[PDB]
Structure formats: C-alpha cells, structure tokens
Design a protein around this nucleic acid. Sequence first.
RNA 1: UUUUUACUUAUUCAAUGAAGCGGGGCUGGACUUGCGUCCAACUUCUGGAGUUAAGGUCC
RNA 2: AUGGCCAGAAAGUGGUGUUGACGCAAUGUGAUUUC
Lengths: 41, 67, 235, 178
Amino acid sequence: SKAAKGAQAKKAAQAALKGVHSHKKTKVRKSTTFHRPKTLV
Amino acid sequence: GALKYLEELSKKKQSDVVRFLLRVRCWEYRQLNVIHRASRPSRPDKARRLGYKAKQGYVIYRVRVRR
Amino acid sequence: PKNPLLEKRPRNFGIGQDIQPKRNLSRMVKWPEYIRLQRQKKILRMRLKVPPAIAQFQYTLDKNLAAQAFKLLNKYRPETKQEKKERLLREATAIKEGKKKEDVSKKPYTVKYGLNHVVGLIENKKASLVLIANDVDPIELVVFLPALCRKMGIPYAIIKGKARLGTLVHKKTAAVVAITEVRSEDKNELAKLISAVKEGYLEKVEDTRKRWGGGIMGFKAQKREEKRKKSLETA
Amino acid sequence: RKAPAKFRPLDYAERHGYIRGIVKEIIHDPGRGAPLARVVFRSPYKYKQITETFIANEGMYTGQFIYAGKNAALTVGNILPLSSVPEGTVVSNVEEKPGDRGALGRTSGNYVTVVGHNPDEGKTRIKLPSGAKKVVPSSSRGMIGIVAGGGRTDKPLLKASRAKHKFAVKRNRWPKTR
RNA sequence: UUUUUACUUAUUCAAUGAAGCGGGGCUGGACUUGCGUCCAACUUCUGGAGUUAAGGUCC
RNA sequence: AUGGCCAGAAAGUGGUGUUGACGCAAUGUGAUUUC
C-alpha cells in the first residue's frame, strides 16, 4: 500500500536522522500503590 | 558576561517571554510546598548582586506568602 | 501420551463471574508528587503557546551533525589535573635551569566554556563556532544567545545535552561551548563543520525560529474535536 | 450508628453490567425512621467479600438477592441508573450526580418520581417528595421501591417522654423555649 | 474596539484501594449506505462455593 | 446541596452531616371539646 511504503520511508528517515534506539522498556505494575524503595541503611 | 543581558531582560516584565516564564514558574511554585529549598537561584543575576556565591554554605529557599 | 488425569479450568473474566486477573495498571498508578509534578510540567509546556525566543530551542542539531561536531571538539578538550601538574613540573624545571616557561610550553588550543567567557568572546568576535545546550534551566541564561550570535555574525548551533557538553569540558554540565581557533591540521575540519552547520541547521531553522511553539491539544481533546467536526460535517 | 447508608462506588460492574448482592440483615438505625438493609456483594478484584449498608425499601427480606448495575432487572431492591427505568417508576436514594452514592428521597415512606427523559442531552427530569421538579443526569442510580417504615408520623407521640426519647438520639434541640 | 460560541491549560467541586477512561481491532445484532454509523459483548428459581492459574505452544 | 442554619482571626478550617422534605431550622399558639 501507498501508506505502507510511506511508513517505510518515514521509518528510514527517522532512523537516519535520530538513530535506532527508538524504544524504552517500562515496568509493568499490577498495583496502583507506589512504595518507597528499600535502600541501604 | 550574560548577567547584564539577564538584568536588562528582567527589567522587561511585561514582554511575552518573561510573562510566559512567570506563568509556568508560578504554576510550578504553587504546586510545590509553601516553603521549599531551591537547588539553584532562578534569578542568578539578582542573587549574585544581592550576595549569593556558588560556594558551599550558600542556600536558596523559595517561599510563598499570602498577600 | 498425556496423562488423562489432567483437566482444563478456563476462567471467564466477565462481570459477576470469576475474579479479574492482575493486569498492568501503570496508566493508573498513584504516582509520587515529584513525578506527577514533572510530567505535568512537561505537559503544560506543550499545551501553552510558547514565544519564538524559547521555541527556537526545540530545533536542535541532528545525530550525524552533532556526532561530527563532537568528533572535532573531542580533540580540543581542556587540560586535566594530571596534565597541568606535569606541565607545571616541566615549567618549574625550565625556570630552575634558567629558561622561560614559553620555551618549554607551546601555545594551547582548547574549547572555550563558561557562559560569561563565551559571551565575551562572541562580543569580541573571537569565537569561530558556538554550541548552545538546548536544556538550560533557567532559560534566560541563553535565550538571547542566538540573537547575539546572529548580530555578531557567528555560526551557532543548538545541541542536545548540557551533560554532553560537560563531558567535553570535564564537568557535569556546560551551558555553552565555543571554538575561537584550532590547529592547522584541523582548520579544514573546522571550516567544513562550520559550512555544514550553515547550510544544514541555520538555513533549515531560518523560518521556523520565528514561529510560536506549543499549542498542542491533548489526546482526548483532539478525539472530541475530531468527533465534533465530523458531526458538524455530517449534519 | 455504625456505617453510612450509601450505595456502591460506581465502577466497571455497574457501568457495564450488573452485580448480585445478598441481603443478610435488616437493622434498626437509631435516629433514622427507616430500616437499613445490610447487603454483601462480591469483589471483582479480590477474594474477600464486601459488606455494605443500604436504605431498605418496603418488601425486602433477609436472604433476598438484589442486582445493582446497568443491565439489572426491574424488581424491588434492584439498583438501576435512571436511564434504565421507564416513565412513572419511583425510586429511592437517588443520586444528585453519579458517584455521590445517593442523596434524594432517603426518608421513610418517600420516593422520587421519574417524570421524563431527555436522551439528546443525556438528562432526566424527576419529581421530589416536596413537589419540586428537578433535572438530574440520567446516569445517576436509583433504587426501586418506596422506603420502608411508612406511616410513622400518623401515630401521635402523646407524651413528653416519647418526644424526649425521639430527639435524644437525634441531637435536635429539645425542649424548645420561646 | 464590542457581542456570542465554543475549547481547556489557570482555578473550583466530587469519587477511588487513583481498576478498566478515550480511540481502534475481533464477534454478533440493527439500520442505512450500498458499507459507515450505534450498541451490545460478561453473571437472574435457590441464605452453597468461588482465593495459591489450570492449560496450549517454543525452549 | 455550587442549599439552609451556624461557628472561626484565618485556613487544603469545622459543625449540623453516619443528614435529604413522614427531614432540618425558626416562629406563634398550646390536651380533648368549642372555634
């Protein structure tokens, strides 16, 4: 599709101008409660 | 130095850039605490002319008071 | 062969029937106040209309040109403590033997850093190239610097990373760096970098630096606006 | 008094389907003329059962199953949004806005009469026990029936002691001086 | 420079253990177009029980 | 109920309120009969 080739060209342009590290891992959270992380005492 | 430019820019408090910065900073300071420590002066030229030096032992605290 | 004693118990997670499974609730986590404040601060800076003098810092150098600039600038890092100590010992030896320090030490060529120093060099028209970090807080320290460079006729470029400039200048953070002059074997590289900056950054941001930034609406607000416009077009 | 007499918090279950609860007890609330129905529901996210207190409409009994949600049936004891009820049905413990767990018609023998719907604005018109005519959001929940304990004020108090016992738990000023 | 007519980013109110908000995709039903809308996915004879993933597939 | 009656110098303050017209608050009169 024309949208498919346009998306491929846009992805190539994005890789050329910004690099390949486009994605970042995000932790999944099964609870909505944030706890203070336990640190060295 | 840059602080001359910062002084002449701080004189123009009704310009678009200064009003935008004051608006976003007012929003931030209103959602912060009433008294809280600032890591650095947000007006370095004013702090420097009032006596602040980037030396250990100089502390900046930001505070809001009801007018 | 599988043991026939095994059986399957599928669970249907509809309303009223068995308990819902543990799903990713990261979109709905009650975040701490500082995380919420910084995310809302970034969101507000996108939502509000940004004046051009601040919005010009959104357009930065791309990866290739920033890499070439750092390849040139990494040859001119400032003197370290051990190198300065060795140079001082050699100069003290020359003084003891009855020679000036200029006889044993050569003329240095380094990058120039420190905001007051770089602004003075720009005003004296000594700096050949200026690189300004895109994320200086407060922004008033560098908001005039593109205009000053344009008036002085200095090639300037906004680059990502005050920490990246600090890695050059052996600090945690540098707001702005500059080159006044280089060595003879790097004069061609400096001129090529200056020309590449001129036709690849400044000509592209010549128009976009005058435009107001921000004004982006939210995801839900954009969806509501699209639905309203579609309903108005249909009716 | 142990717990306030509120509905469930508005969640996925009531907003999309229905959830079943069991009426375990009918209790007397001191200072209130109407009985309260203690109803136990399930928690969709955990193993523990949730115990709640409602305002009991007339005809409820212990061991009765009630259904609260968008798709629940029209039966005495069921909690329904006002969009899911027809014209002329009266409900109790009506929400002013969806999520305040009911505010209207909470007194014994009283009810709120759904007099109309406006589907275009997503609103509904109701009639209050005072005769007032009100417009509320149609996603507000309402509980089918009339509140139990009716006819309480027909009997005379007949004694200063009975008035004293009435107002001593109600904290109102008694006796009243001119 | 005035009016209304909207929007949300200031500000105000409410709820929650900040749990399913919005836009899509799958399925079915309706209308219409001649294939986009809207609307529903899931538990109703019983005062029981429901919680430590069963399983499929690559290793 | 973005309500009434209140309280506090103010408050991201409190009560009525674990409240919602068969209720709350302020009045006048003061069983029944008569009116």
